[PDB]
Swiss-Prot record, chains A, B:
Isoform B is predominantly identified in skin and epithelial tissues from the intestinal tract. Its expression is elevated in colorectal tumors at various stages of neoplastic progression, as compared to their respective adjacent tissues. The gene is RAC1. Glycans are attached at Y32, T35. Changing S71A: Loss of AKT-mediated phosphorylation and FBXL19-induced polyubiquitination. This is Ras-related C3 botulinum toxin substrate 1. Changing C18Y: In MRD48; decreased substrate adhesion-dependent cell spreading; dominant-negative effect; reduced neuronal proliferation. Changing Y64D: In MRD48; increased substrate adhesion-dependent cell spreading; constitutively active. Belongs to the small GTPase superfamily. Rho family. The effector region mediates interaction with DEF6. GTP-bound active form is ubiquitinated at Lys-147 by HACE1, leading to its degradation by the proteasome. Phosphorylated by AKT at Ser-71. Plasma membrane-associated small GTPase which cycles between active GTP-bound and inactive GDP-bound states. In its active state, binds to a variety of effector proteins to regulate cellular responses such as secretory processes, phagocytosis of apoptotic cells, epithelial cell polarization, neurons adhesion, migration and differentiation, and growth-factor induced formation of membrane ruffles. Rac1 p21/rho GDI heterodimer is the active component of the cytosolic factor sigma 1, which is involved in stimulation of the NADPH oxidase activity in macrophages. The modification (Microbial infection) O-AMP-threonine is found at T35. It comes from the Eukaryota. Changing Q61L: Constitutively active. Interacts with PARD6 proteins. Interacts with PPP5C, activates its phosphatase activity and translocates PPP5C to the plasma membrane. No effect on interaction with RAPH1. Interacts with CYRIB.
From Swiss-Prot, chain C:
Residues 1-348 form the DOCKER domain. It is found in: Cytoplasm; Cell membrane; Cell projection, Podosome. Belongs to the DOCK family. This is Dedicator of cytokinesis protein 5. The lineage of its organism: Eukaryota, Metazoa, Chordata, Craniata, Vertebrata. The DOCKER domain may mediate some GEF activity. It comes from the Eukaryota. Interacts with CRK and CRKL. Interacts (via N-terminus) with tensin TNS3 (via N-terminus); the interaction increases DOCK5 guanine nucleotide exchange activity towards Rac. Interacts with ELMO1. It comes from Homo sapiens (Human).
Amino acid sequence: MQAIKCVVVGDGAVAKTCLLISYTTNAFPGEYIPTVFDNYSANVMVDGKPVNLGLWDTAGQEDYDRLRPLSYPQTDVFLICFSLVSPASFENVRAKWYPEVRHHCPNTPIILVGTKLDLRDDKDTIEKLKEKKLTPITYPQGLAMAKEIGAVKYLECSALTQRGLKTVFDEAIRAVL
Amino acid sequence: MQAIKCVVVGDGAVAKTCLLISYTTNAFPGEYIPTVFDNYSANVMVDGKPVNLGLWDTAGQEDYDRLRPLSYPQTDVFLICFSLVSPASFENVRAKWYPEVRHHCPNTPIILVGTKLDLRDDKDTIEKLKEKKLTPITYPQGLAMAKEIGAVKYLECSALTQRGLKTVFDEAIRAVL
Amino acid sequence: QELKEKLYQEIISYFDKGKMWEKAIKLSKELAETYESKVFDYEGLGNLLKKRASFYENIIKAMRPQPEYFAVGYYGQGFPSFLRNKIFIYRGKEYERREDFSLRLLTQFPNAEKMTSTTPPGEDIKSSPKQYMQCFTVKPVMSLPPSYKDKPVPEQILNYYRANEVQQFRYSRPFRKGEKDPDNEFATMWIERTTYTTAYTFPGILKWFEVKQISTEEISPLENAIETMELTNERISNCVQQHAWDRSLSVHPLSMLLSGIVDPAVMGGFSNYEKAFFTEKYLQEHPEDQEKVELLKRLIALQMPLLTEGIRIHGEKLTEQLKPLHERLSSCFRELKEKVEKHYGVIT
Amino acid sequence: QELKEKLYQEIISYFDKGKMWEKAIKLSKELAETYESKVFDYEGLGNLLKKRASFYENIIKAMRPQPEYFAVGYYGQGFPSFLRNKIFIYRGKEYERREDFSLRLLTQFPNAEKMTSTTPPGEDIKSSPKQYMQCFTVKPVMSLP
């Protein structure tokens, strides 16, 4: 048997925790149950052989920054997550999350994923962002960032419709493969 | 498994058939049951390993002399039987039984046994024989005959008390051994 | 629990070094039941199954000597209290004869006087201060399980019960009742068998066990002939079945049996039976006893197909060495068939 | 009798090439009972015991994937009579996800309209001439002997 270790990081304004718990629960969209505990581990494979998948639930709070650097060593892969409709998430990634995670483990394949793909094309959300002088991050910016970081494959997933989330996890599992 | 073939011959005035059927039956002396059939085969061993013992019941009648010569070939041993208290049996052995059996199978170990060992020392039987000008054959004559024929071991058995009969059969079985 | 498992594995080891199978196989079934139902000890279960399979193979392949059985009774006040006026049926060892057993038993009691008669002793011998020992052979009585009733159990299995799981014991008592004809020795055949009953089965906790009840019987010459015919038919059937399930088996037992059946040259039992029963003299002797000769006729008639099967297997094994022997066998087989069909008047 | 023994040995072969154990182990116990009680086929009994021991070893050693379970209900008059207004609980295969299963099921019925809600449909969807398919995952309930 083999196990997969992956570190998922992000800000609290995007709430990747809901997406992760919905994926682990495999429940129907819109009917997820938030749970008290973090660190949702599960035994789900896609191809090759059954393996154990680990998802370290990292808090977006700045106070727990001293607890994160020790989780990076001896980890198979890392998942940097941002939102295409949240410019604040993009700024946070470009400022703190991308540089520090890259610095901690320079030699590891990286996968970049986009959160809230559904709200990227939403007219009301775009109107509200433009009113709040916010610009939804589109595909070219994510592609440019992925080419800058040399990611294996840039991805875009969603939570309300789960669009590509299973493909995202398949790519994450097969990155080592 | 191994089997033993032995041809037993004798006259009708001694009745070795009773002795043979008493040995095969293993019954108490004086309580033997004569049976209708001849050729009493049995599976009894003494030493080494269990083997099958065959005793070809040969009739003393002269009419069945044409049936006897074919039983001798491909036989392990032969048992020449006579009576120490019957001079007629000794004369018959010296005249017909010993020469013909020896002639049929010149290359085979031979065992000579004496019947009615109990009546050899019986005073009334000896008195009746002397009245009938008959002399009981004693040990020296049998020993001389055995040395003449080159027998492996001369023996003397009995039927009423079964004296040495088991030893006789043990010697017959171990002759090949 | 650890004591139980240690004892069970000691049982396994002893059965491995004990050559006993039937009780071993039953206990192996029980141990497999306990394994699968309660403890789920799979490796021990597999080893147990392997050993049981080895027992099954050895049942068909390995040879089991049949222990002999002797009845010994000690009489006289010179024996200890546990030997005085009692009879025990001793289970002989491998190929152990009565002579060696008697010698070894007399070695234990030099003062014992060897009784030369099988007749039960009177009060004088029992109350005498000396030691009197009587030893003789008895025949065990086979007891089959009810599970094997009405079934063609293999002979390798039946021979086990023929010498094991036995309580009763029998012996033959020849009695003379009739004319002392010089030739026909069967004219005075009367049998009064001795019935021995034992409350415990052999083998058991002890090699020997005392008799509980003893009974006597009486066998008329017709009944004696019926029993001899039944015994011979069973022997022939057993030999035929054994050789039909065997390939590298010698024809010597077949030759001996066929020579015995065909020509009782020393003492012809067929003619003796003819003179003893088929003659009108016996009908005067037994006016209302006539159905027994019918049983004899049907017994020999049912023997006939068995003799035909023996001829078939002998011809299957026929060679140049057995060519004249088998020629005589076939000639006498045809002769006896014609005899039973025409002269005897029986219906086959 | 020969048909029975041929079928039993075919069962043995299929269990050898089937990786199913619990029912196989029960049937092996029954076959051992039949062997020892009725037919005394000792070599077949020994081979059966060896295969049962292999099943026992594989139970502890070999890994068993847990099949997924999805509930699918077909609504609308466009489905055949054996699919109309009925719900079936489908046993997913090895590591089979709901997305792949839904794609494969929609491949069978291109005219099927994929229902996006788990709420039971009303009379309109059931009586509609179109094909409406609803697929979602359900959790099996363990039942111990």
